[PDB]
Amino acid sequence: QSRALVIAQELLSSEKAYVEMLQHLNLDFHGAVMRALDDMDHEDTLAREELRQGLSELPAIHDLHQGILEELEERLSNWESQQKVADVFLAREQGFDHHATHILQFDRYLGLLSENCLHSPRLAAAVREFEQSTAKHRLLRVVQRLFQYQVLLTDYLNNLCPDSAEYDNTQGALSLISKVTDRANDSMEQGENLQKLVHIEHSVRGQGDLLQPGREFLKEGTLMKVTGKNRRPRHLFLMNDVLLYTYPQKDGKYRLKNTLAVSRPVMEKVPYALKIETSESCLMLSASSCAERDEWYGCLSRA
Numbered sequence: 001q002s003r004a005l006v007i008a009q010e011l012l013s014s015e016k017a018y019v020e021m022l023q024h025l026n027l028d029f030h031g032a033v034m035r036a037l038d039d040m041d042h043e044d045t046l047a048r049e050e051l052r053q054g055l056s057e058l059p060a061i062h063d064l065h066q067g068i069l070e071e072l073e074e075r076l077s078n079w080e081s082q083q084k085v086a087d088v089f090l091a092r093e094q095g096f097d098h099h100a101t102h103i104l105q106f107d108r109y110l111g112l113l114s115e116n117c118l119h120s121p122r123l124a125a126a127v128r129e130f131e132q133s134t135a136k137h138r139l140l141r142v143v144q145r146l147f148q149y150q151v152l153l154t155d156y157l158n159n160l161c162p163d164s165a166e167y168d169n170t171q172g173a174l175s176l177i178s179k180v181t182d183r184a185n186d187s188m189e190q191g192e193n194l195q196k197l198v199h200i201e202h203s204v205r206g207q208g209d210l211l212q213p214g215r216e217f218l219k220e221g222t223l224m225k226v227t228g229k230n231r232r233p234r235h236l237f238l239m240n241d242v243l244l245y246t247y248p249q250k251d252g253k254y255r256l257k258n259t260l261a262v263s264r265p266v267m268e269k270v271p272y273a274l275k276i277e278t279s280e281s282c283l284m285l286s287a288s289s290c291a292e293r294d295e296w297y298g299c300l301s302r303a
Helices: 002-040 045-055 057-077 096-117 121-131 135-157 165-187 191-203 290-302
Strands: 217-227 230-239 242-248 254-261 273-277 282-286
Touching: 002 045, 002 057, 002 121, 002 135, 045 057, 045 096, 057 096, 057 135, 096 121, 096 135, 096 165, 121 135, 135 165, 135 191, 165 191, 191 217, 217 290, 230 282, 230 290, 273 290
Parallel strands: none
Antiparallel strands: 217 230, 217 282, 230 242, 242 254, 273 282
């Protein structure tokens, strides 16, 4: 009840920040690119028309979320009378279709954008002015909200009564969004990774925002920290970028213990041993098998 109240508050606060972001995207990215492309009409046409189609989704998304925010703001003001938010998503099936449409042409118009900047001073001038505050990276932030609703709405459902019209609606809103995010995973080269990083951020108590350009999730798994003769569990999130060193809690959630920037010793009391070394950090970890130890070795090696 308090737990579900704080999650709707978490949903509203993050929605405000998202609507503010979609606002400045439409003014500084869509607006500036529309202005440029309108000039280029009088300067090829194909690239512009495809850019215009993919860019048309941004105002439609902005309007969708402007509405979600207005309904969310009002519903949280009258929380001690009606304690319902899920149905706000259900009411907007047509709205989230713009998300699906955006996802479907995402890589096409964004690839077409950087490509067309290499020989279009006007388009380059528009994109630079925006990149001021990489565009394709700055637009993953649009599609990322969808994975956030999934994580938030799942935390919202776990605190609802399994026999509520709201538990039902939350499930419906979850399947409605999953219909949309399915397209991200199968139509975007960065969709599967964007999802991994959204779920990994939300699970780790200590890791804020993993969305970094070029960052890609590689391996997860628990290993034992060898402190003398004592063996304590540590859950590892290995990226090409950074190495998250955590502790698995009873919650299914974790705790960021240290972070590392991406040897196999022989010792009796520590069989299946892994020694990860950097100039700032060193970990003495034990695997359960010499195959588990060599699975991680080859993966930590590859990057």
